[PDB]
């Protein structure tokens, strides 16, 4: 009875690990994307105006 | 007479410790996989978190 629910906490925790792992999986694909948009928009802002070179 | 005495307060508390290391045993099963269990929780928990890296 004990070790049934000590494995039941860790059974379930595995699952939300997976779930957060799949999560951040999701978000990374757009993520990445989103980086490299603001630095050559940034770089752009730049060029349009006076500022800077 | 004496000896009789003697040895029953030895035979006696034999008994005990070898029941007293069956308790022992019969925890240490289970107790081994809440500490495994609770260390790896304590690690996913910082991670479902912005706590620490």
């Known amino acids: 009875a004990q ?3 000590m494995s039941e906490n860790l059974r379930r ?7 957060k792992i799949s999560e951040a999986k999701t978000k ?4 990445q994307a989103r980086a ?5 928009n940034a770089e752009l802002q ?4 006076g500022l800077g070179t």
């Not at 925790?13 to 779930?19: G, S």
């Not at 490299?36 to 050559?40: D, S, V």
């Not at 730049?46 to 105006?49: K, R």
């Open 3 to 5: 070790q049934r629910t």
């Open 13 to 19: 925790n595995l699952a939300a690990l997976e779930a």
């Open 28 to 31: 990374k694909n757009m993520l």
């Open 36 to 40: 490299k948009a603001a630095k050559a």
């Open 46 to 49: 730049q060029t349009l105006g």
